[PDB]
Write a protein that binds this ligand. Structure first.
Ligand code: MET
Length: 521
């Protein structure tokens, strides 16, 4: 069924400045968005900020400034950061937005009418820093900034506090069977698979009901009032999760400002999310609470939740800084190549340089220069191939198979594997070039060079197309060197081998141009 491909990041708490975690989550969101746009689909990619709640209000009180001022400023820092990082997110949502607040009230009211919200009590542990309710099994002993004996979260290690409050309760327990049915009927709905197993095991064990309001004093009045009861505020997570629904309902202008909230999500064809990108730290909220709310409201469920191995929240790592040093595309490639769904990845300067030099410069960059060199490509054009050998055909087969292979990986989604698949083809092309030695062929066998050169050019085009969501700016430079017309830089038609006809002219040269400058050890 044709709809707008809808991909999201988490919305980030504004208690603190943007750092690598948020940049990474949003980068994944952006790449998925970009790949689907490259496929020729309609796309709406969403990111933003989570601005209410005890955590933010206490950060504001520490900084000695009003929550309104504080959130607006920090939100500004997130926007600047995401502009600097050269993402292509369609909209930046803030939970302080009045249209979002309206949507939250609608959803709350819907849950209440459905009978799924009642007045009760929460008495138990709470991590303010995670805005999370915890059972006694999920806490243990530890220390605070003052070095005092306190209780901490087993999840996150943050300080926990005992809360005893009359709260509005959501009947989460009533949704256990339906959630299990959903997980089992849609075994690709949570990625990676071991995180899916975790969610299933947790829900199988049983679900308590969930507090969805707090006393207003507790949150320093910095939250959305409960409809028909201004003594209570809406739980920051029901508030926050609802952003995906709000985003799905905002008409947005050319400048990126929201201009209108539609009544019916179907009008914009975005809801529900095709992919919610999150960190492992917020899996329960997105794979248990969120769908339970949607089930209560009779709203459609998201297709995929992908949870990565990082946390969303004297060893600094600043992505803007590193991008200015090593290059923006390069840095993005590294972050997406270096790690899959684990915390198991060497993010040092040494490894960054190793991948820059080895993969980007020596494998990709070298190859681009070879097939566009005046020495080898004497006519500065795509030549017409002669007859193919069996060796030619083996390389051609790999290039033809690549789009389907990379497509599946992108759709999982598993961006690391998609990159590896493309670079496996790039290594193969390099080896082919080394065996055919086109530099010798210029004098020896011009007819044979035509064939070798054409396959090389075409291999570079196809790999680069499939890499364009990862290296958005560098892909443009490469296509410019190859003289690939704009029309051939996107669309599934152009995944096919042979889409750029012989006789196409290469792009102009530059006196000492390089794609990726190698760096010292
Ligand atoms: C609805 S996604 C909310 C994410 C949360 N504010 C965090 O930073 O972990």
């Amino acid at each position: 069924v044709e709809k707008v491909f809808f991909v999201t990041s988490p919305i980030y708490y504004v208690n603190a400045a943007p750092h690598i975690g948020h940049v990474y989550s949003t980068l994944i969101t952006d790449v998925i968005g970009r790949y689907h746009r490259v496929k020729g689909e309609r796309v709406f990619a969403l990111t933003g900020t989570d601005e209410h709640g005890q955590k933010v209000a206490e950060a504001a009180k520490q900084k000695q400034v009003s929550p309104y001022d504080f959130t607006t400023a920090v939100a500004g820092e997130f926007k600047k950061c995401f502009e600097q990082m050269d993402y292509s997110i369609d909209y930046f949502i803030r939970t302080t937005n009045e249209q979002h607040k309206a949507v939250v009230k609608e959803l709350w009211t819907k849950l209440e009418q459905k009978g799924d919200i009642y007045l009760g009590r929460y008495e138990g542990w709470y991590s303010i820093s995670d805005e999370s309710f915890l059972t006694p099994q999920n806490i243990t002993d530890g220390v605070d900034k003052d070095g005092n004996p306190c209780k901490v979260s087993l999840e996150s290690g943050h300080v926990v506090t005992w809360v005893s409050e009359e709260n509005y309760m959501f009947r989460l327990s009533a949704f256990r069977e339906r959630l299990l049915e959903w997980y089992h009927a849609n075994p690709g709905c949570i990625v990676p698979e071991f995180r899916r197993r975790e969610v299933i095991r947790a829900v199988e064990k049983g679900l308590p009901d969930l507090s969805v309001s707090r006393a207003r004093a507790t949150l320093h009045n910095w939250a959305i009032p409960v409809p028909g009861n201004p003594d209570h505020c809406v739980y920051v997570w029901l508030d926050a999760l609802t952003n995906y629904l709000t985003g799905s309902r905002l008409r947005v202008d050319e400048s990126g400002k929201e201009v209108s909230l539609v009544d019916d999500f179907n009008e914009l064809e975005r809801f529900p999310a095709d992919v919610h990108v999150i960190g492992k730290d917020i899996l329960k909220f997105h794979a248990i609470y969120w769908p339970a709310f949607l089930l209560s409201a009779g709203l459609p469920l998201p297709k995929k939740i992908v949870a990565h191995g990082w946390w969303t929240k004297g060893n600094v790592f600043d992505p803007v800084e590193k991008a200015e040093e090593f290059g923006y595309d390069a840095l993005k490639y590294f972050l997406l190549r270096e790690s899959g769904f684990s915390d198991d990845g060497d993010y040092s300067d040494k490894n960054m340089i190793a991948r820059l030099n080895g993969e980007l410069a020596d494998t990709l960059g070298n190859l681009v220069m070879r097939c566009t060199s005046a020495k080898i490509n004497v006519n500065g054009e795509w030549p017409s191939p002669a007859a193919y050998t069996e060796e030619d055909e083996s390389l051609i087969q790999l290039i033809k198979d690549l789009p389907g292979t990379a497509d599946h990986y992108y759709l999982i989604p598993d961006i690391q594997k998609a990159i590896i698949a493309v670079f496996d083809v790039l290594r193969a092309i390099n080896a082919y070039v080394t065996d055919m030695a086109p530099w010798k062929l210029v004098k020896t066998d011009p007819e044979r060079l035509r064939t070798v050169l054409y396959i090389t050019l075409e291999g570079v085009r196809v790999t680069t197309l499939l890499l364009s969501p990862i290296l958005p700016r560098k892909s443009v430079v490469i296509f410019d060197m190859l003289g690939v017309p704009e029309v051939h830089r996107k669309g599934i038609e152009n995944f096919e081998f042979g889409a750029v006809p012989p006789g196409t002219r290469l792009g102009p040269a530059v006196e000492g141009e390089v794609l990726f400058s190698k760096r010292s050890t």
